[PDB]
Paper text:
Ucl fimbriae are attachment organelles that facilitate ExPEC adherence. Ucl fimbriae are phylogenetically related to Uca fimbriae from Proteus mirabilis and F17/G fimbriae from enterotoxigenic E. coli (ETEC). Tip adhesins are two-domain proteins; they possess a C-terminal pilin domain that connects the adhesin to the main fimbrial shaft, and an N-terminal lectin domain that mediates attachment to specific ligands, therefore dictating host range and tissue tropism.
Given the close phylogenetic relationship between the Ucl fimbriae and the Uca fimbriae from P. mirabilis, in parallel we also determined the crystal structure of UcaDLD (84% amino acid identity to UclDLD) at 1.6 Å resolution. The model was then used as a template for solving the structure of UcaDLD by molecular replacement. The final UclDLD and UcaDLD models contain residues 21–215 and 21–217, respectively. Electron density was not observed for residues 43–48 (UclDLD) and 44–47 (UcaDLD), suggesting that these regions have a disordered or flexible conformation in the crystals. As expected from the high sequence identity, the two structures are similar, with r.m.s.d. of 0.6 Å for 189 equivalent Cα atoms. A search for structures similar to UclD and UcaD in the PDB using the DALI server revealed significant similarity to F17G like adhesins (Z-score of 14.3–15.8 when using UcaDLD as the search model), although the sequence identity is only 14–16%. UclDLD and UcaDLD have a completely conserved pocket in the same region of the structure as the N-acetylglucosamine (GlcNAc)-binding site in F17G. The pocket also contains a tryptophan residue, which is known to mediate CH-π stacking interactions in the interaction site of other carbohydrate-binding proteins. By contrast, UcaDLD bound specifically to ten glycans from the glycan array, all but one of which, surprisingly, were different to the glycans bound by UclDLD. Binding for UcaD showed little direct overlap with UclD, with the highest affinity binding identified for UcaD being to neutral glycans containing GalNAc on the glycan core and sulfated Galβ1-4GlcNAc structures.
Numbering used by the authors: 21 to 43, 48 to 217
Write the structure that this text describes.
């Protein structure tokens, strides 16, 4: 079908956080996960469409932190919303971008935001160029929000939020397709010297 687009999740892995060595200050970023990307978060319709993705985080927002991801290509710091993983002392901050590398990392610091095209955050009629899929890049960093014990800590799998597919084609827009944005759970290690 022309509008038979279906969602697929985009996921990032707790297991890529390096060991956290502590030689304190809260909040502070304790490491970045390896950024991930999915070209086909929405895919499958036979008719090309102008599409955009609205990300709504759905974990509790604890506060803000200023940061500049080592990954991505922003040259100045931004405020990021710190989201509660549920594990005391541990939050995450999120950035998302369009799939293609020229598009910028968008700090998640609003109750919802268009991750691609960023033009849509100030132009309600802006969409990606017409094509047959919508994808994205996902960036996450862990934040110490309080004192961490030594040793291993398990992070549960968390749904960071969802991307709503919007389009200037009503039949596709009105499906309100949504794709989950996932933090795959895992184990981190703190070495408190
Ligand atoms: Cl993925
Ligand atoms: Cl992909
Ligand atoms: Cl950044
Ligand atoms: Cl969850
Ligand atoms: Cl239409």
């Amino acid at each position: 079908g022309a509008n038979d687009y279906v969602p697929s999740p985009i996921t990032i892995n707790t297991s890529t956080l390096p060991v956290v060595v502590i030689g304190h200050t809260y909040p502070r970023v304790i490491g970045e996960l390896t950024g991930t990307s999915n070209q086909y978060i929405f895919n499958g319709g036979s008719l090309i469409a102008l599409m955009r993705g609205k990300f709504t985080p759905t974990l509790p927002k604890i506060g803000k932190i200023t940061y500049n991801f080592r990954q991505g290509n922003n040259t100045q710091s931004s405020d990021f919303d710190i989201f509660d993983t549920g594990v005391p002392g541990l939050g995450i901050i999120i950035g998302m971008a369009g799939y293609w590398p020229a598009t910028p990392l968008v700090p998640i610091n609003s109750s919802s935001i268009y991750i691609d095209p960023v033009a849509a955050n100030t132009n309600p009629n802006a969409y990606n160029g017409a094509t047959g899929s919508f994808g994205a890049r996902l960036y996450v960093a862990f934040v110490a929000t309080g004192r961490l014990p030594n040793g291993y800590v398990t992070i549960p799998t968390k749904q960071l939020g969802h991307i709503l597919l919007e389009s200037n084609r009503a039949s596709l827009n009105n499906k309100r397709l949504t794709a989950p944005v996932m933090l795959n759970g895992g184990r981190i290690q703190v070495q408190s010297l």
